[model samples]
Target chain A: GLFGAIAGFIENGWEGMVDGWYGFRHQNAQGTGQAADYKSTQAAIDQITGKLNRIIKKTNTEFESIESEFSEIDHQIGNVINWTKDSITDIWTYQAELLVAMENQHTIDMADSEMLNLYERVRKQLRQNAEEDGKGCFEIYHACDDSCMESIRNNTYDHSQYREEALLNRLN
Target chain B: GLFGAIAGFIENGWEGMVDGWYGFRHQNAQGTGQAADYKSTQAAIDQITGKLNRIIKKTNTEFESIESEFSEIDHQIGNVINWTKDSITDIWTYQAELLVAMENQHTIDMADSEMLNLYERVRKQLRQNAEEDGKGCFEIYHACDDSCMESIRNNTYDHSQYREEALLNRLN
Candidate 1:
């Protein structure tokens, strides 16, 4: 029996991505705040969505079959623009969505291998943003304590205790 | 021109996954600490790698064409066991790794689309864990302070201000 077929026999109560999406929703980010950095970051995503759409359409076969998936992916792509706007941000969520699109692309035999190029391009963009521009880095937040408070009152919640070492973790 | 060709003409300065990885390395997790839950999580990953290997081998086309990518992916597959062991863990990291595998499968025009099934399978596994078992949820940590500390000393770096909302987040 195929594993997909066995999926019927497996548990069916699984919740959608909403549950897991809420899980990490509060983490902060430390990408650049400068105008040029944000603009360059926008340029990177602009490149990704541009080539992604081009490849998706021109690479053709998978698009012809699973049009819906592409729609969903395009939806995520647009949302990515909203989230990634102005600065490199949330590398996990957006890349994850396009990765889903890449997964769907292979469901068709006649699809162009050139179609699968979207994920790596996004990967490379984010990698550059993280490395060179220092965008898309992780951030942490803390509600200040009376003991550790420097200038801020204990009630103030401040963020970002970054280590260059923190940037060494890899998604792949 | 092939898009990957543009990769050479484009920037060569990507700092790799380590940089962005270091970006979010300290985020914590909310999961079932029960042994049964851990065992069940192990079973899900075991199924993924088992079926993944089978699909990789029997689907055969992409495997033959880009053997090294598969090798690297399988290395990630093994590492997932180390990371996902005893509990469903680090959903973003491991899924992201296997996703890198799924991306690589399309380099050959002769490859099977069925080879792409692995990502969805892993997706389903994590979704299930996040939904029913409360495994793979995100966690945040904070150092105890004079203001927020009750029973703990000021030095305690306690983590996991978990909301079930945390489990709703998705990698896709």
Candidate 2:
């Protein structure tokens, strides 16, 4: 009768399965021939329940571990984004500075050459000594001609060529 | 006798638990007393095993999905690091260009001013025919002094002051 009652409860639902097992034990106390069978049933139930509980516990632990890993990934992603944003700002500032500096150089070069030419014209008109400050006034023209002008021209040319290429590379 | 055999199998281990149930069943065929107990034990084993299997399967699926998510995060992180590296190169190049251009401008401005002063001195020495080119020969001085020189000076001064500030902001 106890075994019959337990089976009936199990067929009902898992919610009532344990309660049925308890009922089975109580009934078995008054029985003798079914004692061994009831004990075996109880052992199987205990083993299965223990295994199921362990599985659930392991799953929960694994879930928590995965969640922590996700949090770490998220944190790293945020750092990379912030670092990239800062780098971009630096690039833009440097770009503007380059442009402004190039324009300034160009203006200065043009003005300097014109002024130097005017100076030579005046020195010739006065027929004065051109070498007043340990160097002839004409030396300015020669010095600039030798390498200064060439260097300035090269700088601008190189920047024009490289700036676009550099920008394109960064974009990619 | 059947219950005694099942209890003996149960003491052996979980591997013997199922064997004991089978033994119970076989014994039940000979006797009606323990049949209900054997059926209840079998039902409990089935329920626990079924639930455990479902839990394991679901956990594996969840793990696979999380792994795919981690892979996506890794790909994105790689892209960000590469982008930042390229941007840094661009910034360095541009920074070099800016400094070179600034230096070039300073040199040109200094040379131009000195040359212009020389031209004025020469013009004064030849005071006989000063107004030759619609403006006096000394008009070069006036032209520069009037606006050109002032503008060049302003450009350099502003650049020096602003360049550092701009660089500092970008650094952050």
User: Which candidate wins on DockQ?
Assistant: 2
Candidate 2, residue B109: how far the Cα is off, in Å: 6.1
User: For candidate 1, lDDT tens digit of each residue in A1-172?
Assistant: 1122222222232253232211111222332211112332344445556656755643335523323433454543344333323222333344555655654433321122212222223334333223211121212223222332321212232223422323333111
> In model 2, what are the clashing residue pairs, if there are any?
none
Best by TM-score: 2
Runs in model 1 lying further than 4 Å from the true structure:
A1-44, A59-172, B1-172
lDDT string for model 2 (B49-127, tens) is 6434532331111111212334454766577566667767876777667655755554333333332333333433322
Chain A of model 2 scored by TM-score: 0.25
Model 1 clash count equals: 22
Candidate 2 lDDT tens digits, A1-172:
1121122212332343343222111111233211112333464466556645644442235322323433454656556555555556655655555455445444434433433333344344323211222112221111122233233323322234334544343222
Interface RMSD of 1: 30.4
Model 2: how far is A112 from its true place, Å? 11
